[model samples]
Target: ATRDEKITYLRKIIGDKGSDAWDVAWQEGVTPWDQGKIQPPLRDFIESNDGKALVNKKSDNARVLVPGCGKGYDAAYFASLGYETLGADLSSTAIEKAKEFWAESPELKSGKLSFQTLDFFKFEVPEAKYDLVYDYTFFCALPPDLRAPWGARMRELVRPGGTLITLVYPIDGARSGGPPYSIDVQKVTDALQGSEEGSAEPGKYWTKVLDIVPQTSSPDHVGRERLVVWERINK
Candidate 1:
């Protein structure tokens, strides 16, 4: 095909132009990945003993970041829980839809919630690092090579002693092909639980404090989802 026609392929895979891929998907009206509400396991986790403990530790104006936040479901969920949450997506359409959904929902009014479009790789690291950073389908949506940077970016965002809640979804070792690429638990750890050397991003690494095969999920995701929480240990 022609040059513009040839460019469409890269726009479907997770790579340097990952944002464009997602935007194209949205524009093409093919987004079946969204759940229209927060994942039940996430709601359960936040209400559990461990979840409450994390909140109790940092609920005061705690900032939460939900990257790859399509439609802002999870971000608003956190915001409703009293944390100031921001949902970030690379797709402008997704962000727009998120705002639309937020505007329609009477529940989102109580939460300090907002949406933005940004490249996570180029995201500005903050001095007041977030108390919690959540990732659900976001990680699995990346190209295999697009994964390692996830660890570094997450580490930079979550404060020392902060929580990173990862809901590993559609978890299978299949590796066929997809935005819903089958994710491995080992790959998740390998990135976050890297060699604890000072050279590895200022000497900080994660301590996996909790892991659970969640008891709840949407029908398709039931057995395929896992909830794992990591604490960014003080370096």
Candidate 2:
């Protein structure tokens, strides 16, 4: 199918139901976004000096949120590091599968990790604030129209002085018309910065802390991904 055709088909499947497409995809085992293992860049991030500092600063009990967490690999990775990690997905199938995948893990039994079926836009934890919010494939999975809203919601979930780490991917045009849509890197920066094009105020929503072109083991993602880190500035 052409890009437009695929998008039309996906839109129909997701009509008026925000997560229907994802649920259907899970049911059909159609998740190309699933890298099956933790992406290399994230692994490197968690091991780098800066990464160690952030984790140490937050300590073992720091709250971490991974929205649109498929299979929960990244969440599990964080949990393994002792962060209190929550992996949330709108698809029950995905959540259940993730739970099953990690059922025997000591971390789940020890309360270091958990998974929930929840919508990112409406998810909340009473009297809780996240110290770090990680975005991997979640941003590009959404319809482009939701980018601004996604940014706003991220702002709300992350606490003042917390961090938001994003892995920008699929910069290549392979998935042009998509449920896995192509993302303009600058637009993501703009959205998180909470500013319209060409007009940004310093310390409005976040401040760029680190931005780097990263190497990845994924064939499709090679030379096409960037690891960008932003620290929440204004609550």
Candidate 3:
């Protein structure tokens, strides 16, 4: 199919139309972007780092939020590492399936994982604040137009000094088609480079590229993903 044709097809499956086609796409099958399991890059990242940042500190309370959490595999993984994990997605169909998936898995349902249907743009995060925010596929899944607002929301949702870890996919095959949209890292940096501008106050936000997410990830994702951390410093 042509690029426009593919975009139309995927948009039909993912758009807000609420059509039966989109519903079927949501159910009874794995979408191409599903990854079949928790992304290996993330698993490797947490493991290699000894899970310190997540488990350390006075608030080792382990409250974490996974936004746009489709099937919830990443959230489940965080829960397994002892986080009080909440996976929120906009689709009820996805949330129900994620709940079912977690319920059937002993490791996930060990009283640490929960799933809810909530739009990320408007969801009310816990006032108690979260220690960590995991962004696996959520960033790319959003429309390219929402990038700036998304960055701002990420800053707001995380607590002071909390961690925002994201796996940003590069703009490789997006010229063809993708749910995995292509996003420029510099654009992300530009969007979040706010508090850095000095007008917002000092020590409010900082971003660092952890690594290119070593080759330990699944082969398909080997060179395509970048692991980075965004530390929120102000209220």
Question: Is 1 or 2 the stronger prediction by TM-score?
Answer: 2
**lDDT of candidate 1 over 1-235, digit per residue (tens):** 5533433453444456555778877776667676688889998998999888877887577899999998989988888777888899999999999989889554456447888887888978778989899999999888677788888788888888888999997687775666677896777887776555554443247888888988788888877889999989865
- lDDT, candidate 2, 1-235, per-residue tens: 5555655766667766666778887886666566677788998987889899998898555889999998999899988888899999999999999999888878899878999999998876546679988898899888778888899898888888999999887676555555667775686886777775577665678888898887554676777888999998755
* Superposition error at 62 for model 1 (Å): 0.9
Best of the candidates, lDDT: 2
Candidate 3 residue lDDT tens string, 1-235: 5555555666666666532333365664535566557876687777665446446552656588999888898888888777788898877888888888778766565666888888777887678778789887777776666777887887778887778887777546446334557765565665565545456443346545354655565676666767777777645
State candidate 1's TM-score. Answer: 0.86
lDDT of 3 at 224: 70
Off by over 4 Å in 1: 1-18, 104-111, 196-204
Candidate ranking under lDDT, highest first, comes to: 2, 1, 3
**Model 1, residue 143: what's the lDDT?**
68
**Clash pairs, model 3 backbone:** none
- Where model 3 places Cα greater than 4 Å from the true spot, the runs are 1-8, 13-24, 28-30, 58-60, 106-110, 173-178, 194-204
Better of 2 and 3 by lDDT: 2
> Which residue ranges in model 2 land beyond 4 Å of their true spot?
1-12, 15-18, 173-175, 196-198
